[PDB]
Amino acid sequence: NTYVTPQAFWNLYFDFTGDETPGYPKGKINISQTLFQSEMKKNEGQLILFINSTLYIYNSDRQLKLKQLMRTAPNSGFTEMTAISHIGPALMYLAKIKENGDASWKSQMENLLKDIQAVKVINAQTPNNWLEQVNAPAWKPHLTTIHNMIDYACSMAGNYMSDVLNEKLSFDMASLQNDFLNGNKTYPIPYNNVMIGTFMLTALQSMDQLHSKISQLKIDWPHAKVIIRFVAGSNVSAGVSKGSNWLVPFVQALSNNKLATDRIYITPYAAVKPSLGAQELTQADYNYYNNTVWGARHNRRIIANEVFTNITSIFLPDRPAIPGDYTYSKPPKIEDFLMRLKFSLAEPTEMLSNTVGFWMAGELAEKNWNYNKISIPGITTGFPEGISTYPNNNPVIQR
Amino acid sequence: NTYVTPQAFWNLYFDFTGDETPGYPKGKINISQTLFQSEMKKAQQNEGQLILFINSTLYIYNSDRQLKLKQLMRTAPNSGFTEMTAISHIGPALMYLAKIKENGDASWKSQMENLLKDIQAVKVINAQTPNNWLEQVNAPAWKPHLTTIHNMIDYACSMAGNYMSDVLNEKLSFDMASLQNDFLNGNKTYPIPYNNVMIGTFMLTALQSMDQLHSKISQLKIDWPHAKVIIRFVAGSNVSAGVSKGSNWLVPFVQALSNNKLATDRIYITPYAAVKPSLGAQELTQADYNYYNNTVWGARHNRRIIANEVFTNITSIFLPDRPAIPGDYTYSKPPKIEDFLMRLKFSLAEPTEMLSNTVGFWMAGELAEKNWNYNKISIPGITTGFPEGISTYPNNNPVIQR
Ligand SMILES: [Cl-]
Ligand SMILES: [Cl-]
Ligand SMILES: [Cl-]
Numbered sequence: 170n171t172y173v174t175p176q177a178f179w180n181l182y183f184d185f186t187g188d189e190t191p192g193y194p195k196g197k198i199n200i201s202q203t204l205f206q207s208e209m210k211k212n213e214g215q216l217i218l219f220i221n222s223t224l225y226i227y228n229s230d231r232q233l234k235l236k237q238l239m240r241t242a243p244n245s246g247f248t249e250m251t252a253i254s255h256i257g258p259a260l261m262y263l264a265k266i267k268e269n270g271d272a273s274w275k276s277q278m279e280n281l282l283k284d285i286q287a288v289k290v291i292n293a294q295t296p297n298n299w300l301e302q303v304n305a306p307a308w309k310p311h312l313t314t315i316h317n318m319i320d321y322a323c324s325m326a327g328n329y330m331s332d333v334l335n336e337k338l339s340f341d342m343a344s345l346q347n348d349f350l351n352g353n354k355t356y357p358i359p360y361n362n363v364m365i366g367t368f369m370l371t372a373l374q375s376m377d378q379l380h381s382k383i384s385q386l387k388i389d390w391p392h393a394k395v396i397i398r399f400v401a402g403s404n405v406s407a408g409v410s411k412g413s414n415w416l417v418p419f420v421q422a423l424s425n426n427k428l429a430t431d432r433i434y435i436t437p438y439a440a441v442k443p444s445l446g447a448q449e450l451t452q453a454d455y456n457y458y459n460n461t462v463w464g465a466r467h468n469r470r471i472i473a474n475e476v477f478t479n480i481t482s483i484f485l486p487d488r489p490a491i492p493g494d495y496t497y498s499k500p501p502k503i504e505d506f507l508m509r510l511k512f513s514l515a516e517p518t519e520m521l522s523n524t525v526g527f528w529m530a531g532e533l534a535e536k537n538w539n540y541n542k543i544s545i546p547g548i549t550t551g552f553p554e555g556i557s558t559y560p561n562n563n564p565v566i567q568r
Numbered sequence: 569n570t571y572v573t574p575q576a577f578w579n580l581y582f583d584f585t586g587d588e589t590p591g592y593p594k595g596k597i598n599i600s601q602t603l604f605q606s607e608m609k610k611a612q613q614n615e616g617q618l619i620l621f622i623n624s625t626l627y628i629y630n631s632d633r634q635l636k637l638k639q640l641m642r643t644a645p646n647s648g649f650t651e652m653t654a655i656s657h658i659g660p661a662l663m664y665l666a667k668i669k670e671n672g673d674a675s676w677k678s679q680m681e682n683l684l685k686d687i688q689a690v691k692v693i694n695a696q697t698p699n700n701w702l703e704q705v706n707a708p709a710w711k712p713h714l715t716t717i718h719n720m721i722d723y724a725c726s727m728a729g730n731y732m733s734d735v736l737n738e739k740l741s742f743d744m745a746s747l748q749n750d751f752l753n754g755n756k757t758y759p760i761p762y763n764n765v766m767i768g769t770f771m772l773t774a775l776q777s778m779d780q781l782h783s784k785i786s787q788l789k790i791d792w793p794h795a796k797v798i799i800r801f802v803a804g805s806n807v808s809a810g811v812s813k814g815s816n817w818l819v820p821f822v823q824a825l826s827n828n829k830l831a832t833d834r835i836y837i838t839p840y841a842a843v844k845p846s847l848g849a850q851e852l853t854q855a856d857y858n859y860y861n862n863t864v865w866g867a868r869h870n871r872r873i874i875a876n877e878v879f880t881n882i883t884s885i886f887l888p889d890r891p892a893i894p895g896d897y898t899y900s901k902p903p904k905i906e907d908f909l910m911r912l913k914f915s916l917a918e919p920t921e922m923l924s925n926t927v928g929f930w931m932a933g934e935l936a937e938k939n940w941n942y943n944k945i946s947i948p949g950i951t952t953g954f955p956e957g958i959s960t961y962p963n964n965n966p967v968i969q970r
Pocket of ligand 2: 820898899929930933
């Protein structure tokens with residue numbers, strides 16, 4: 170076919186849109202561009218940008234106020250906390266490896282037990298205990314509990330693995346759940362509680378570090394502009410909707426609910442501009458995020474509602490309240506977070522941090538970031554009836 | 569701080585995960601890797617076609633990394649897209665001009681003068697005979713309604729043109745409210761609302777785009793139960809839309825193509841997937857193929873399998889899809905034009921939505937019901953939805969008086 174679109178059609182097309190497309194006529198200012206420039210002419214806020222793994226905060230004068238990496242610090246206690254948490258999933262994986270008839274489960278569990286014994290010893294080191302050296306102010310009220318818990322965890326998991334390898338217990342998905350994950354006569358606090366406790370401390374550390382930094386900027390929250398284009402490493406399908414990104418309730422918490430949720434836009438296809446991260450954003454890069462990205466989403470919402478008043482408005486629901494959410498259950502159950510962990514792993518839309526992210530953001534908001542008043546499931550709450558905290562003197566690992 | 573994580577903790581950490589992370593000890597086989605290895609003796613394989621909606625184009629690649637199909641789902645050159653979208657966009661353009669005026673920017677007058685000039689040029693080119701653009705464009709799905717389509721663009725130009733003329737000649741007021749009452753809802757001279765032109769034009773755009781793909785994909789041998797669908801589709805500058813299945817009509821459209829033989833869990837919306845260099849080439853590089861097939865598609869699918877097969881002691885959660893709303897095929901068996909207007913308002917206000925969601929969900933369902941036979945389908949804003957007393961768009965429409 171030799172058919173060619175008449176020029177009159179392109180001229181009319183380019184009158185409203187196409188300004189970012191190659192082929193757009195050089196020199197033209199279309200109706201969309203006029204709109205995002207008219208808004209500027211006739212108290213402008215901060216630009217909060219979660220782009221990839223970094224946070225960027227820029228003021229009205231295009232000056233950098235904060236550049237923070239969302240990546241976990243080497244002195245945060247993340248690796249330490251996560252290593253203990255992962256003992257549950259590791260044992261689950263080993264039960265599956267056994268079911269598939271792969272004998273490597275025995276050698277992997279032997280090494281896992283050996284490495285847990287080395288952790289028990291290092292955790293018991295005094296003075297200059299690793300826990301006293303970690304940068305986590307929010308944990309300070311519970312340092313003794315955190316110590317006893319890692320000790321309890323190593324003792325429980327170690328002696329459980331020992332019993333499996335010495336054939337005192339059976340090994341399968343069912344046995345693992347009843348003999349270890351749910352607890353036993355010697356170790357009555359379920360390992361399920363240790364998994365949730367450790368995750369919770371990791372969420373609390375991450376959120377406390379961010380609140381400490383963002384608080385010192387004295388942001389005028391009612392006028393803030395929030396852009397979320399956050400990528401969780403290789404999870405290219407997660408946190409692209411507000412119900413599946415705990416950064417949304419977390420930012421609300423930071424603002425003390427003074428920032429309207431409609432001022433928060435998840436823009437996964439927004440460009441990563443060249444001057445992003447510089448002390449000064451270029452006017453072109455600033456106008457891009459402020460007007461082209463944030464402004465366009467905000468203006469469309471206003472124009473549609475102000476012009477189409479004769480057309481009935483549709484409202485779609487948010488995702489339902491599910492286990493792990495702050496409001497779902499009070500007090501929360503440990504099983505609630507286990508359910509959320511499974512859901513977060515299976516669902517492409519979810520991040521593993523959603524397991525506790527939504528809960529901890531709500532708790533910190535409710536308790537106004539006061540460490541002495543917050544409850545931490547798996548650390549301060551969720552103990553079996555009759556138990557108040559993790560025991561101090563725990564049996565040695567018998568190999 | 570001089571703090572160093574104790575080695576015992578790293579050793580324990582690396583026993584289960586970290587195999588993809590830099591810093592992972594050379595030679596180690598962790599528990600995740602053993603599970604992966606053991607499951608392979610018994611996960612995701614190499615067979616099945618890669619169906620990739622990346623930016624504006626659909627790419628289909630076979631197991632042998634060979635290109636089977638490359639089609640633009642929007643902005644296809646000389647396809648009726650630009651022509652039809654240009655007319656659809658007159659409504660939003662005028663809405664934007666009303667806001668520019670409210671903000672006290674006088675540039676609305678010069679932008680409207682030019683908009684009116686360009687609508688007059690389109691009216692004339694649309695009236696050309698013989699060799700009318702509509703008779704030349706490869707749009708076989710439109711063939712049953714060519715006369716109606718012609719009269720509608722003529723009507724649209726005449727209505728919008730004379731409306732803008734009246735505003736600039738101060739015969740009418742111009743604001744959000746006035747625009748709705750005097751133009752979008754219709755007027756004494758032009759009784760068919762411009763709202764109907766917006767639905768009609770959007771409908772034809774959806775129909776053309778979906779028909780062109782069906783014609784191309786039909787000629788291919790696709791093993792739908794084993795297909796691997798990746799959606800990283802971007803509706804131009806709308807950087808926040810179609811990032812969830814309920815806000816992307818490509819999801820039901822692909823289900824329709826598969827004749828519901830493709831499982832919805834095999835469809836992943838991956839907005840952060842990279843646009844690889846050999847994408848669009850006759851042959852995808854082994855690195856680029858392994859990226860989309862294993863790094864992108866495979867990992868999402870493997871995590872469903874790991875959760876269900878390994879976390880069997882944890883109760884599963886089910887979340888329903890979004891409810892049916894006006895503009896969905898499943899919503900109203902005979903659809904009302906009011907439904908599409910409601911969906912147009914919703915699509916334009918909500919950052920999660922694309923304007924193509926106004927009709928996309930409906931047209932995918934209608935086409936599927938009639939087994940893609942466009943001679944059997946009804947088209948709201950073209951064949952139906954006219955004000956009481958009107959059957960179609962008028963033929964002789966007043967000239968644009970500047
Ligand atoms: Cl980054
Ligand atoms: Cl539908
Ligand atoms: Cl009708």
